Design a protein around this ligand. Structure first.
Ligand code: B12
Ligand SMILES: [Cl-]
Ligand SMILES: [Cl-]
Ligand SMILES: [Cl-]
Ligand SMILES: [Cl-]
Ligand code: NA
Length: 400
């Protein structure tokens, strides 16, 4: 009863999850490649055959060219690439110095300097990318200076991620995964007392974030939370993870996990694997070939949705009709079709990220928050959220 397991998952719901990723395997441009998709598939019970090798080949070309390149690569994006390499049993820099290892180490040094000596500053990216980058170096058997690790320990020790925009456990779980890797290598040994305590702290916070329905924080934090719990057994994990199983099953029946990044975080845990398996991974794992799904019928049913923006002058409010199952992005496009509404996005590994509305671009340390009136942050982005009839969705420019 001490191991976190997810037994008896519906086989078809899982198959459909993998089928949703399969067509993304053909989206090979620098503008759409996502190393997390490759990782998630390799750690899953499913495979895409030779499409995987072509995906990895294109990942290598993209991340090597952007050391030609069109968009700059964040530290955490490089870290996910390092995870993809481990998923193919490849190791960087075991015999010579490696540019990518150095680039990622310097990203962390830059973020450490941004945080500052009194933890009075903030990362230029996020503590999520900070922890992800420590983890990715660690699975390649690369250590970082104690001073880098100390900043993440301090944030866990002082409940730092609560202030930040998101209030769930994704960042804490990622930090725990990083710490778990450090512990297994006995890296940063002077910090070992802090590291081992922080692992317990993170596990305890995850368990306390469990809702009666069974998810940890929210349904989309639940994959990384489950990874952290799956790294090691403990009292109560069996029952806690069985509750999470029920939450995941119901969410899948309700249409959750259509987003590729989210699918890629869920697939490993459904196969009882985590990013810690990338220290010593099976590259001969048993995995069933995916086949394309058949398209669902077209619909003429409609939903009425009100779009509201109070962060601009004059404010904006318009009720539009879109087809049922249309996305929030479709609602924005309909509003733009009908009048002077405008919006802008930028690409991310999670899909389109909203960056400007009605001519107002988010500044540094600002973002456009998506809310269901009154004041309930959405759990999905514009391309994936499917508004319900009679809802009002607000776009609000907030401070990070
Ligand atoms: C950091 C972060 C943020 C930061 C990003 C800014 C920063 N300083 O980096 C802030 C707080 C601003 C943020 C905002 C949002 N986020 Co957020 N975020 C994360 C987090 C913790 C890590 C992402 C990351 O760095 N990944 C690694 C890097 C390498 O990947 P990347 O794609 O290059 O990272 C970028 C994108 O993640 C993007 N971004 C962040 N969140 C989201 C969400 C969506 C749907 C999209 C398209 C983009 C996006 O910002 C990152 C930096 O540029 C994840 C947790 C997770 N489990 O993945 C949640 C997560 C991705 N976010 C989520 C959500 C829902 C949102 C919001 C829609 C919340 C809201 N209601 O407004 C908004 C985005 C709205 C918009 N403007 O498009 C969900 C998405 C779930 C899903 N079904 O896809 C996650 C999984 C958290 C959760 N468990 O609920 N987020
Ligand atoms: Cl089973
Ligand atoms: Cl309309
Ligand atoms: Cl209008
Ligand atoms: Cl705009
Ligand atoms: Na218009």
């Amino acid at each position: 009863g001490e191991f976190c397991v997810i037994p008896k998952m519906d086989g078809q719901l899982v198959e459909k999850l993998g089928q949703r990723l399969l067509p993304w395997m053909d989206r090979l441009s620098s503008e759409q490649l996502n190393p997390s998709i490759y990782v998630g598939l390799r750690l899953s019970s499913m495979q895409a055959g030779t499409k995987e090798n072509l995906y990895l080949h294109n990942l290598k070309l993209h991340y090597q060219q952007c050391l030609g390149c069109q968009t700059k690569i964040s530290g955490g994006s490089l870290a996910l690439y390092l995870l993809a390499l481990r998923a193919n049993c490849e190791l960087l820099g075991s015999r010579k110095g490696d540019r990518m290892v150095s680039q990622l180490k310097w990203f962390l040094e830059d973020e450490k300097k941004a945080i500052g000596h009194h933890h009075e500053g903030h990362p230029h990216t996020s503590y999520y990318q900070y922890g992800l980058s420590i983890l990715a170096l660690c699975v390649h058997r690369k250590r970082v200076h104690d001073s880098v690790v100390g900043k993440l320990l301090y944030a866990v020790e002082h409940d730092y991620f609560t202030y930040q925009g998101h209030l769930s456990v994704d960042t804490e779980a990622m930090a725990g995964l990083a710490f778990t890797c450090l512990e297994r290598f006995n890296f940063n040994s002077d910090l070992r007392p802090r590291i081992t305590t922080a692992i317990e702290t993170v596990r305890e916070k995850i368990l306390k974030a469990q809702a009666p329905e069974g998810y940890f924080g929210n349904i989309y934090s639940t994959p990384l939370a489950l990874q952290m719990l799956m790294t090691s057994p403990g009292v109560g994990l069996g029952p806690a993870c069985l509750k999470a199983r029920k939450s995941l099953l119901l969410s899948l029946q309700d249409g959750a996990f259509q987003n590729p990044m989210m699918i890629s975080q869920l697939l490993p845990v459904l196969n009882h694997k985590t990013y810690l398996n990338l220290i010593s991974p099976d590259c001969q794992a048993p995995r069933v070939m995916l086949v394309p799904a058949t398209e669902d019928p077209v619909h003429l049913s409609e939903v009425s949705v009100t779009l509201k923006v109070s962060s601009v002058l004059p404010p904006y409010e318009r009720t539009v009709s879109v087809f049922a199952g249309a996305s929030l992005e479709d609602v924005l496009n309909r509003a733009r079709d009908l009048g002077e509404f405008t919006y802008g996005t930028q690409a991310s590994l999670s899909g389109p990220y909203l960056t400007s509305v009605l001519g107002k671009e988010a500044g540094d340390r600002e973002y456009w928050q998506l809310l269901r009136v009154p004041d309930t942050p959405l759990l999905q982005g514009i391309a994936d959220y499917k508004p319900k009839n009679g809802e009002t969705i607000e776009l609000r420019l907030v401070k990070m």
